[PDB]
Design a protein around this ligand. Structure first.
Ligand code: NAG
Ligand code: NAG
Lengths: 213, 211, 230, 216, 107
């Protein structure tokens, strides 16, 4: 099966540079137009760069022309994008997708994407705060961390039903989110309920047992 | 009398496939009506006047043809389309139907959920003894069943029944029942129900022992 | 030779580059008229219907019905390094259509003698709309405006009339049914509404009838036509 | 809306005679061609007889011409078919279906059918046997054995138990039918809640309800 | 560049409804590709060359349009159709996508 695997994304400071690579498998890489397409936080799709089957000619929209540079190694079945002078606007999830003149330049295959974050904010660990006071609803406030992601689980994953993990938001420059779990009145506080917040960027794991006020 | 030949008799297809059945008439006919029949219910009007779709019939269905060759076509076969389809003519007395085209839909290779049952103690008092063996929700339809009384086969007294393809999950189900006299039932211990299906190289057996 | 408009622009009423006005030629083609032009067409194609393009010559037949007085087929000739334009459109007569308008929109370009809003009829019903024609000679348009499926392909194919005894009614070709020759056909579409009709000119061998079926959702209707002579 | 209800079917001995009636509702009965159409055990649809809207003219294919007789009472919204000299080949499920000249004689409405059995075998009542053993789910069964003839209806918990129910078709053993119906429920209700198969045999005027209990 | 406008932004519908979204282009475009994206996954090819359906796309889906007006239609909306739908053009550099119409359900 056709497969495209982006890699190399992460956090880059303002003005920095980063190279993203894409691994292709399961088709004749040399016969398809490759292209990097990114998805903004506004969930809009934008073509970053594109290249022809033989790697000769390339196009870059004026927004990134000169800054970024697409490239392909057909011997290694790889597609590379050297992005330089990165600005905050470049913060997006970058997809590696293909096209063919014989399918009316249709994007029939896309990778899962690699996430690029262009910011100068310093990596900050989270501060877990418990949220405590029929189906009683408990909470778990994750406050003041950077950057995304953060994994919030309840009872090490066993508590899955009735769990809403709201998206994160920028306070001043740090993220803040919360997770709402709803269990009946019987299992709480008789049986324990704990939210497990992990922040891999800061190498931090927190487990806060929710107790009554 | 006009003979309506429907081919193929069984139309096997995977979901999404573009399939077409054929209604070949002995003499020329000016139109062909199409009716869909799913088990447990009467025929349902499907395609009117060769090409017009009955109310509620999904757009994927289509009809065409003229003279002695008509057809019904499904652009992207969906699981709910598995049924028997009949073509009907009335260009001359008498109005004749077709043999039918039963629509088989490919599915995940499913192993049958077998279950054997010893004869009920109520039936034993009456002098009989029937062993039931269910084989439900399997795919493909091809399957075989044998009864091994203490190792030896006993095809005499075995009744088998099969359901058509389930329109929901596209699987099949079969019931087998070996009937025996109360005396003959007591003379043996092991009662096995062997089933040979594509899902396994070795047969799915289910035996019960009278302890 | 009595119904030919000939325009001679190369090397039975013969027009030449004198009848043009500012190199334009507005041609009003009567229903029973023909137009044969002799010139070298600029792009060898023309007529932005029944046309015949043969070498450096072109012939066009007048359509029975015209929807807008502005619709026209335009040819451009090039003779002696000069460009001449010929606009051809039929004489504008707002002929009525002898049939049933099953649709509900009232801003249509077509006018029907009868009408029956199928949207109002009961579901799972089959209501009839009869249209009759009784003249010695005919010059009429018979059709329908169905918002949904039409059975059969009308009016190239039609549905035989109902049998008194228990006999089936079949689909026949209109040419065979009414037993006349140059039956002109015409189609149109206003949104979802389909407008299929046929023309009829001259007398008729034997009084005959036919039916066309129109269905929409669970509602249905059918138009029965009857034409007579002799 | 439109509704057609066949009735009167059953077991008739060789050469006998029987009248089937069809009740019509929800439409102008007098404006629709009615017809009786049967379905053979080989799963074949055949036109038995037809009638026009006013009941005047009728047609019967030569196979049954003279033996059967269609009729309609438009005042009572009824369709009748007097079948005489019935042969074993006439054993079929008889549908009551309609047509209209204005829909190109399309069978837009059928009935549920009434089952005709033409045989000399004696009417025999069924013998319901429960199917239970002695671990996520559990499959229970209900064996109907030695009845004659079909129609027969097998339901579970008076119809409430509908999902996971396979009612296998009937088969002739020697000259009596035999069928079975499976039902698959989780293991939670197997010892706690009750599950009953409701077998009915109208021909023998018999209704049986067997509560499935564990083997003891 | 060519701006692709997708309306409505949110298309809420009940199962069975016939629905249609609209992709209005700033200038004329010769074709529009359609892609369906469900959360947690990248976009998926849905409608090719304005009207052709990608492999596995159910028959209820349909594409229709020309010039500056294109559309995507679902005859009988099914629960599985809830997703965001993007239209894509490339009649002139640069290739541009649409804002995306999100199919929401009703209960
Ligand atoms: C037709 O055009 C040719 C041009 O050479 C001319 O010789 C001829 O006399 C014309 N005839 C008529 C009837 O205008
Ligand atoms: C006819 O009326 C209907 C009203 O529903 C409208 O949708 C349609 O656009 C109208 N047709 C024309 C040609 O204006």
């Amino acid at each position: 099966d056709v497969k495209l695997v982006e890699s190399g994304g992460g956090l880059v400071k303002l003005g920095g540079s980063l190279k993203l690579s894409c691994a292709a498998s399961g088709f004749t890489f040399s016969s398809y137009y490759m292209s990097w397409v990114r998805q903004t936080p506004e969930k809009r799709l934008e073509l970053v760069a594109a290249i022809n089957n033989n790697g000769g000619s390339t196009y870059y929209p004026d927004t990134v022309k000169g800054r970024f540079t697409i490239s392909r190694d057909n011997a290694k079945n790889t597609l590379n994008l050297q992005m330089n002078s990165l600005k905050s606007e470049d913060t997006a999830l970058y997809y590696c997708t293909r096209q063919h003149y014989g399918n009316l330049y249709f994007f029939d295959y896309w990778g899962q994407g690699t996430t690029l974050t262009v910011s100068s904010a310093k990596t900050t660990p989270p501060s877990v705060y418990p949220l405590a006071p029929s189906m009683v609803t408990l909470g778990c406030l994750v406050k003041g961390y950077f950057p995304e992601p953060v994994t919030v689980t309840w009872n090490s994953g066993s508590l899955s039903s009735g769990v809403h993990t709201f998206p994160a938001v920028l306070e001043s420059d740090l993220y803040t989110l919360s997770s709402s779990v709803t269990v009946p009145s019987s299992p709480w506080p008789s049986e324990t309920v704990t939210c497990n917040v992990a922040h891999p960027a800061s190498s931090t794991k927190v487990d806060k047992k929710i107790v009554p006020r | 009398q006009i003979v309506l030949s429907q081919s193929p008799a069984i139309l096997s297809a995977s979901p999404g496939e573009k399939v077409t059945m054929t209604c070949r008439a002995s003499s020329s006919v000016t139109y062909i009506h199409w009716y869909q029949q799913k088990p447990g219910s009467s025929p349902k009007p499907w395609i009117q006047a060769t090409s017009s779709l009955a109310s509620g019939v999904p757009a994927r269905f289509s009809g065409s043809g003229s003279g002695t060759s008509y057809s019904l076509s499904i652009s992207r076969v969906e699981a709910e389309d598995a049924a028997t389809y009949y073509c009907q003519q009335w260009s001359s007395n008498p109005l004749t139907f077709g043999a039918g085209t039963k629509l088989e839909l490919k599915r995940a290779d499913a192993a049958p959920t077998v279950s054997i049952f010893p004869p009920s103690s109520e039936q034993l008092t009456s002098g009989g003894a029937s062993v039931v063996c269910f084989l439900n929700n399997f795919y493909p339809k091809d399957i075989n069943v044998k009864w091994k009384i203490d190792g030896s086969e006993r095809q005499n007294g075995v009744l088998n029944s099969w359901t058509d393809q389930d329109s929901k999950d596209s699987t099949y189900s079969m019931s087998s029942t070996l009937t025996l006299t109360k005396d003959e039932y007591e003379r043996h211990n092991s009662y096995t129900c062997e089933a040979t299906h594509k899902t396994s190289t070795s047969p799915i057996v289910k035996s019960f022992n009278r302890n | 030779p009595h119904n030919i408009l000939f325009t001679n622009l190369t090397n039975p009423k013969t027009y030449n580059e004198s009848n043009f006005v500012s190199n334009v030629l507005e041609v009003e083609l009567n229903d029973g008229e023909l137009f044969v032009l002799a010139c070298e067409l600029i792009n060898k194609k023309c007529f932005q219907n029944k046309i015949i393009y043969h070498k450096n010559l072109t012939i066009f037949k007048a359509p029975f019905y015209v929807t807008s007085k502005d619709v026209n087929t335009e040819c451009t000739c090039k003779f002696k390094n000069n460009n001449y334009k010929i606009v051809l459109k039929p004489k504008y007569e707002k002929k009525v259509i002898h049939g049933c308008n099953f649709s509900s929109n009232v801003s249509s370009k077509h006018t029907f003698t009868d009408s029956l809003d199928i949207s109002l009829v009961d579901d799972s019903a089959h209501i009839s709309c009869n249209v009759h024609l009784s003249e010695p000679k005919y010059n009429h348009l018979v059709g329908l405006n169905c918002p949904g499926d039409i059975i059969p392909d009308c009016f190239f194919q039609v549905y035989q009339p109902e049998s008194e005894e228990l006999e089936p009614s079949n689909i026949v070709y209109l040419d065979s049914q009414i037993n006349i020759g140059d039956i002109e056909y015409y189609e149109d579409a206003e949104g979802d509404d389909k407008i299929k009709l046929f023309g009829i000119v001259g007398s008729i061998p034997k009084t005959t009838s036919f039916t066309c079926i129109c269905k929409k959702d669970k509602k249905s209707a059918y138009m029965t036509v009857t034409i007579d002579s002799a």
